Write a protein that binds this ligand. Structure first.
Ligand SMILES: [Zn+2]
Lengths: 217, 25, 71, 129, 83, 221, 101, 132
RNA sequence: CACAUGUUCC
RNA sequence: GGUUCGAAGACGAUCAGAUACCGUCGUAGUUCCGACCAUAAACGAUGCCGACUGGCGAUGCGGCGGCGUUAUUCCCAUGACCCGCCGGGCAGCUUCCGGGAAACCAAAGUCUUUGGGUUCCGGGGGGAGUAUGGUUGCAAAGCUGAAACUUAAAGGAAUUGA
């Protein structure tokens, strides 16, 4: 990831970041997110640096690969946008998916049937999933978070600066991570592109599911 | 007894001692 | 202490001298009025003359009659 | 106003050490502070410092390591004999294995071990461990 | 910790924080044990060893836990030095 | 009778795979099983009850009274623990405090006073701990001095392995719950204070859960 | 103990403010301490607004409103239920109640 | 009050998720279906559970239910989750790019490309909500 | 518009 | 000089009684000038000077820079807005900095790891801010200020019932 031309920025990933609006930040700015931002455009939107996003995206990809057991990587999404992206990421990689309503006590209460013991916590949104960060303190848990400019850094341990508000920019970043964790371990060759198309990971609104069906009919 | 009126009672009592001591001199 | 000057010994000693008079034990042991009001006058024991025997009623809940002597 | 200069420098870098800053800036530069910083550096308590000598009282940037617990100052500078120098370090230093009391002597400014070697007393400056 | 005759005497040596250089306590349940995978230069694949770090729980609650790993990551060459 | 593990940290304890409880403290992993302590130090460990505190609350039909227990625990070499449990009945609270006391045992640091001959006996430096208004300080002491302290923290220093130490207590020490916890914090900070001997770069060994990540999946969940 | 950080008033740097009387009673209340209500209301609300309209000589005449700046004391406003007591965490909220009707 | 208690409700939840093909719509049939497949100690609870089942029936053909596990409705949701359209939502030949973000790519390596169209920035900063 | 007051122990 | 209000007082209600709360009057006073008086819950219940220790959005003044909308109109520059930066000015929000018995505190932190400087002030509760002495004041009263004796609690924060 450090000045290695195999892992530097790809042109195919540039057009994907811009079309999904991942470089578009929030209106406000958290003082820890002053190092991931190029400059604030007119209309008061900060611009997230995509190359530095890609560099932080690679460092978090080193985390899951270093975890020898793929099962105990807890991936949690609470907002309605992110359950569809995190479920197939856990299916493709081998991680543990949690889709909505994070029960308080899954990492602290032994009697619970959902008592999990991960080595890694991957968070779709720090504000939407602050509760998983609370039990990430009581148990020694390195934490990955998909942070926005507005997202605080309470008990996150590595952050990938992205747009976690837009639906297209949410599932694309997981489609980033689905490729890369399988690219250091041997599943995917880097010469040919990975065959799964990124609309599979994107959130489908119930209106959009209803919108789609008559064009198929 | 409020603390305000016991101070007022003291001043009425202190003034009474002022007149009583003054007539003897 | 509040003041920490290199030549504030007379300020520190005067403060400790004055604030000692506000202590109940120091003022009792260093005033003539406390020794004047003491019938013993610093004596551990003393001899007196019995003139009558007085019965003293007791205090709150524990109630009895205590036998005393006017010495 | 600013009565003591070393007291403000030592507490400024103690506040940074509690927060764990990598380096800290102190606003005045004095000969005593420069001598004070050289005492701690030979023992490896801090990272390497540098001064910015402008045409005023200069500014000192001191790189910090994580080896500092507390660097205090004793005011006023009480004179210390050789007889009660053990008494000073008994109630000020944490232990006899480590902890350094630095105090100015006629031979210069040095910690309490080197003052024992040269058999010279003087006025106390501060404590650090 | 040493004795006079040259033998280690403590029953264990505690860890140290990678960023703040403080020793991590035994009841610091918010401690981090990072594991950073290396990449082979030519094939771009996982090697097999670790580049592990250790951060105390105070840094996480103060919000520099991502920055602390990031600063060592430039120094250990994981992050591109231009960034 | 037989122990079945619940937390996956305790699974390696039953597989004869965790060599000591030191590397448990090395990685600051939480202990939530009282019998993990019983596997390593189940023989030399002893228990001693500090106080039975009959607290109560005012209800409409009288006062609801329950008994609060204070048990300090730990073998006389390297480890000491404290546990507080407030149950309905005295023996249940005493039994329930022992379980919580084993979960809260901490390693001690023993230092020398001046000269460094023999075995470490006293506190290596001046550490202190406090809760509420009770503040307790620990002072290094020469050999053969004994524990100069109040009787209740004296039992804790017997059970921590420290034979010589000078103490000083500031605050309302009649409250034994705060008086015992304030001392127990002070011993617990011995491995929280940085020592000039400890200035070397700590070599990182493999994580205990990492080293047997294949052993913890081939036989159970 | 201290109930309110601002002591139930907006006085922060003044130290002294002019008092104002109340609407129900004549209680002397400081201006920043008084519960101030400004009510925008018509002279007639539901029934009399209708029949006067056809009885008005001038067709399509808008009825003028009435503007009264109310000044209540602590005892008067609570007894008249202008404001009510809240929990210790609910006290710190100072946003107005939602306005839809 | 004809409010169903937790014992009646929880007994009716397990029946639906296990006997979807056996259950009907009208009250009297699934009353007798649940008679054989459930050990209900009294006739009163047998009518109450089957009656609450019938009220849950009207929720089933009108859409999904929160607290239920139906093998047929999850199959509808499973293929909808695995839907793949014929092109991606990322493949547009038209990408509108802010000029301030055009300075971003030019200082990077990937500055000038084929299908990047720079727009015109809005003049006059007006983005904050009015105070109050 | 008024609702003033009711010794001590668990 | 006294409009209004209004200690005292008068009268009418209420009540067992009102010498109170309610209502009608109403002296002193409340209004202006010249002199005393120096006491307030005179509060941020938080002495004054100096340094350090997170951010966040506001607001007052002054200064600096900048697309742009809008007036003199004939635009530069000045006004009114918008976007930032600087110094302190009153504040607010926020969090495991840290502290405190807690309430809570950017100070009430940088304290048993105790020392930047300098004043005032407290030693369980009453007696008592009392007596006496001194001093000021036309007076009211202001400042300083006990002891004899009595007492095992008084008190502060917080929890649960009533
Ligand atoms: Zn009023």
């Amino acid at each position: 990831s450090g000045a290695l031309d195999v892992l530097q920025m790809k042109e195919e990933d540039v057009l994907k970041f811009l079309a999904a609006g991942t470089h578009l930040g929030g209106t406000n700015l958290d003082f820890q997110m002053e190092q991931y931002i190029y400059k604030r455009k007119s209309d008061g939107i900060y611009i997230i640096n995509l190359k530095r996003t890609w560099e932080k995206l690679l460092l978090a990809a080193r985390a899951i690969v270093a975890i020898e057991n793929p099962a105990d990587v807890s991936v949690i999404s609470s907002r309605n946008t992110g359950q569809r992206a995190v479920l197939k990421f856990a299916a493709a990689t081998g991680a543990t998916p949690i889709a909505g309503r994070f029960t308080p006590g899954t990492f602290t209460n032994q009697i619970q049937t959902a008592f999990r013991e991960p080595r890694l916590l991957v968070v779709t949104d720090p504000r939407a999933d602050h509760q998983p960060l609370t039990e990430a303190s009581y148990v020694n848990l390195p934490t990955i978070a998909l942070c926005n400019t507005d997202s605080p850094l309470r008990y996150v341990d590595i952050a990938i600066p992205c747009n976690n508000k837009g639906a297209h920019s949410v599932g694309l970043m997981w489609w980033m991570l689905a490729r890369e964790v399988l690219r250091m371990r041997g599943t995917i060759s880097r010469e040919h592109p990975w065959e799964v198309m990124p609309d599979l990971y994107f959130y489908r609104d119930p209106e959009e599911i209803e919108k789609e069906e008559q064009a198929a009919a | 007894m409020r603390a305000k009126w016991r101070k007022k009672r003291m001043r009425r009592l202190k003034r009474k001692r002022r007149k009583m001591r003054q007539r003897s001199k | 202490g509040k003041c920490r000057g290199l030549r504030t010994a007379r300020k520190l000693r005067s403060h400790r001298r004055d604030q000692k008079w506000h202590d109940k034990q120091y003022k009792k042991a260093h005033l003539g009025t406390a020794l004047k009001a003491n019938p013993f006058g610093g004596a551990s024991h003393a001899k007196g003359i019995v003139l009558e025997k007085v019965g003293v009623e007791a205090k709150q809940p524990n109630s009895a009659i205590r036998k005393c002597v006017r010495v | 106003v600013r009565m003591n200069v070393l007291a403000d420098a030592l507490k400024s870098i103690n506040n940074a050490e509690k927060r764990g800053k990598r380096q800290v800036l102190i606003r005045p530069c004095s000969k005593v502070i420069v001598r004070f910083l050289t005492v701690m550096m030979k023992h490896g308590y801090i990272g390497e410092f540098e001064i910015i000598d402008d045409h005023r009282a200069g500014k000192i940037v001191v790189n910090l390591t994580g080896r500092l617990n507390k660097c205090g100052v004793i005011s006023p500078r009480f004179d210390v004999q050789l007889k009660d120098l053990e008494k000073w370090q008994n109630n000020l230093l944490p232990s006899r294995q480590f902890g350094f009391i630095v105090l100015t002597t006629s031979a210069g400014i040095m910690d309490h071990e080197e003052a024992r070697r040269k058999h010279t007393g003087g006025k106390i400056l501060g404590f650090f461990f | 910790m040493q004795n006079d005759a040259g033998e280690f005497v403590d029953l264990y040596v505690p860890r140290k924080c990678s960023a703040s250089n403080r020793i991590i306590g035994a009841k610091d349940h918010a401690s981090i044990q990072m594991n950073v995978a290396e990449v082979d230069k030519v094939t771009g694949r996982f090697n097999g060893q670790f580049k592990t770090y250790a951060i105390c729980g105070a840094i996480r609650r103060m919000g520099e836990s991502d920055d602390s790993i990031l600063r060592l990551a430039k120094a250990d060459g994981i992050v591109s030095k231009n960034f | 009778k037989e122990w079945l593990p619940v937390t996956k940290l305790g699974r390696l304890v039953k597989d004869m795979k965790i060599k000591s409880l030191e590397e448990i403290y090395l990685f600051s992993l939480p202990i939530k099983e009282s019998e993990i302590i019983d596997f390593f130090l189940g023989a030399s460990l002893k228990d001693e009850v500090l106080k039975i505190m009959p607290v109560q609350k005012q209800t409409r039909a009288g006062q609801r009274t329950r008994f609060k227990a204070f048990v300090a625990i730990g073998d006389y070499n390297g480890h000491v623990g404290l546990g507080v449990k407030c149950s309905k009945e005295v023996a249940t609270a005493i039994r329930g405090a022992i379980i919580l006391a084993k979960l809260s045992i901490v390693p001690v640091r023993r230092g020398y006073w001046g000269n460094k001959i023999g075995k470490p006996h006293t506190v290596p430096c001046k550490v202190t701990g406090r809760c509420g208004s009770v503040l307790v300080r620990l002072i290094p002491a020469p050999r053969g001095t004994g524990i100069v302290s109040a009787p209740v923290p004296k039992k804790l220093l017997m059970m921590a392995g420290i034979d010589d130490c000078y103490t000083s207590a500031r605050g309302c020490t009649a409250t034994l719950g705060n008086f015992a916890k304030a001392t127990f914090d002070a011993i617990s900070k011995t491995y929280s204070y940085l020592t000039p001997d400890l200035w070397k770069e700590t070599v990182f060994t493999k994580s205990p859960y990492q080293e047997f990540t294949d052993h913890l999946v081939k036989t159970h969940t | 103990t201290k109930k309110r950080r601002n002591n139930g008033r907006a006085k922060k740097g003044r130290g002294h403010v002019q008092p104002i009387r109340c609407t129900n009673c004549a209680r002397c209340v400081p201006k920043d301490k008084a519960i101030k209500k400004f009510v925008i209301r018509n002279i007639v609300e539901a029934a009399a607004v209708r029949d006067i309209s056809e009885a008005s000589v001038f067709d399509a005449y808008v009825l003028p409103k009435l503007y009264v700046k109310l000044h209540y004391c602590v005892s008067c406003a609570i007894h008249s239920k202008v404001v009510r007591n809240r929990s210790r965490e609910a006290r710190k909220d100072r946003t107005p109640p939602p306005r839809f009707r | 009050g004809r409010v169903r208690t937790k014992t009646v409700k929880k007994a009716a939840r397990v029946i639906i998720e296990k006997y979807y093909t056996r259950l009907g719509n009208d009250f009297h049939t699934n009353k007798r279906v649940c008679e054989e497949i459930a050990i209900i100690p009294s006739k009163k609870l047998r009518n109450k559970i089957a009656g609450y089942v019938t009220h849950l029936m009207k929720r089933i053909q009108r859409g999904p239910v929160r607290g239920i596990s139906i093998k047929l409705q999850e199959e509808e949701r499973e293929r909808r989750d695995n839907y793949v359209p014929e092109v991606s939502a990322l493949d547009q030949e038209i990408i509108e790019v802010d000029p301030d973000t055009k300075e971003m790519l030019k200082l990077l390596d990937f500055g000038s490309l084929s299908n990047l169209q720079v727009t015109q920035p809005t003049v006059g900063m007006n983005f904050k909500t009015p105070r109050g």
